[model samples]
Target chain A: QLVEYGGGSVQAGGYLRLSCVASGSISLSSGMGWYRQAPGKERELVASISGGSSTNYADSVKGRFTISRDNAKNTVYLQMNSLKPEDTAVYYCAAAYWGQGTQVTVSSLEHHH
Target chain B: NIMLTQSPSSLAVSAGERVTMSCKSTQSILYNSNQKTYLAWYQQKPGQSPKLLIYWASTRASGVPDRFTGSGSGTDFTLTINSVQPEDLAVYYCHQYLSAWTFGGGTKLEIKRTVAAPSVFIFPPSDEQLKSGTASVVCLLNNFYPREAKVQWKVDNALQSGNSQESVTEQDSKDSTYSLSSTLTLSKADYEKHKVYACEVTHQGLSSPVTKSFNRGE
Candidate 1:
């Protein structure tokens, strides 16, 4: 359950991409999934990859999110397109066997006039 | 391979007393070959593997104390103790070898040796839940040495305020501490009315109860 997320940010109305590289046996566990927890807000499911390849998404961010996995690296990629202010949250990667909170904080893109 | 029901899931026993717990099987487990029941009993101390005690319905495993006896026939069986010692106070399990295994639910001998009050937490609802009509909360009791703890949820100081369940206790090897969780769900709309939500815990170590509370704010 060593889910690793190198935190990053994105511009408003832009694309944000990050990967969760799980350590140890990833494919051997139930499946790879992602969770989203907004600051001072709710924790929600972004999506998951089933059967190591089949993808399913939560209704909360259904079409906006796309999840894919890389077996060689033991990683699950969470791609969010059309990011908005509301998209700021902490992203987590999970497998059925283990869970260690290695998180990615998604903050809004900084702006200067 | 029938269902096995263990009774008195827990007992508070002292050092000097004859104690007995029952493990009733759905049907007889007597074997035709030896004319003996294919049953066994085990005892587990905290943070340790279950060690064998008795086998073959009425026989003790090699080196086991004579005080530990197994008796019964057919569908009924019981494990008895001539005297309970501090180290002997632990969880007991019964198994049938008819199949690879079919184990009884298990019974715990609760002896108050020392106190280990667990650290308790109540996680609040997320933002999405706050915006929605429903809300759910989690109460976690962590790293308690004594293994057993009880959880209760209250809304505005009233008990049984929502749907709740206590999870089975789990162990960690390094810490030798046990933990469990409780969850409760209710309508978000009700929060504005009831205002205060609490997660209370009672442990053998704690002379007084512990309470964690969350208040709905306008």
Candidate 2:
């Protein structure tokens, strides 16, 4: 079974939310983070949530990006309040069991011209 | 941001050689208050993403082979392969969590599986590029084994810069050998000076560097 991740396109300033659900069971005993791979860039861990549900983020995504989860359902979520061009990337889920990766494309107003 | 550097970009070894590589940090990664180190090591074999090898700069991850040992602290670290295995041939990397996360350029572990030598070639800049302001030439090295080679560029008899290099170098590929293509780009005015641009490569199969040259404006 695979870790299926949900993603979609969004315009700048729009709300963007994504999710990753593992195929098996979960403990919620521990909290985990997510990795993001941008074009021509190294994979980076950007956001995480604690078992207590407290959230932490990389400086690059500090304010606008946040994480949430439903460990009982074996799922995690990443939410961005206002999408930006820099936010576009293939976001991966889980530490050991990685998802196939889901691309979240953010289009800019400039490119809309 | 924390900066990391791994020494000896590549190493060539046989199946049973003892291997050691060092990863150096710009600053100490030990959190004095907690007395813990914020460093991790990873191994990436051909055609696959990296695997976690060690964390906290010392403990091996679960299920990892015991032959791979990591030890060291503060600003310097070591990852040693007790006895190198043919399956151990791959690139190793270091990561830091001391502050901002950062990655060290990987150090490649190469195995000597063949005695074949490299074929070298120098290519002139394309006319379209010369028509533009800047121009670049390429040095292509192909069909070599072990995937370990050193590249050097010389401009008018002296070691020079202003270049880039690459090679897939995966042993599991359909082809058994390797290839590295280096490119040197300079301003049109530099090429007009008629300088001799040379590409030199030294490999395990060759006793000395095999070189190729191109004289622009000739």
CA lDDT of each prediction against the hidden true structure: 0.73, 0.77
Q: What is the per-residue lDDT of model 2 for residues A1-113, given as tens digits with 9 covering 90 to 100?
A: 23646676555676877887756544465666788877457989889877788888998888788888876686788887777656767788764556688766554423333
Every model: iRMSD: 25.8, 14.0
**Residues A8-33, candidate 1, lDDT per residue (tens digit)?**
54345657677777665556346777
DockQ of 2: 0.02
DockQ of 1: 0.01
**Runs in model 1 lying further than 4 Å from the true structure:** A1-113, B112-218
Per-candidate interface DockQ score? 0.01, 0.02
lDDT of 1 at B63: 96
Indicate which candidate wins on TM-score: 2
TM-score of 1: 0.38
True contacts reproduced, candidate 2: 0.00
Predicted candidate 2 versus true structure: per-residue lDDT over B1-218, tens digit per residue: 45699998998777777899999986567754456677899999887899999998998999999899988876789999988877887899999864446799989987766567889999888888889978777888788876668888888888876555565546643344677788777888876775788889898888888889978766
Fnat for the candidates in order? 0.00, 0.00
Error of 2 at B87 (Å): 1.6
For this target, which candidate reaches the highest lDDT against the unseen true structure? 2
User: What's the CA error at residue B11 for candidate 2, in Å?
Assistant: 1.1
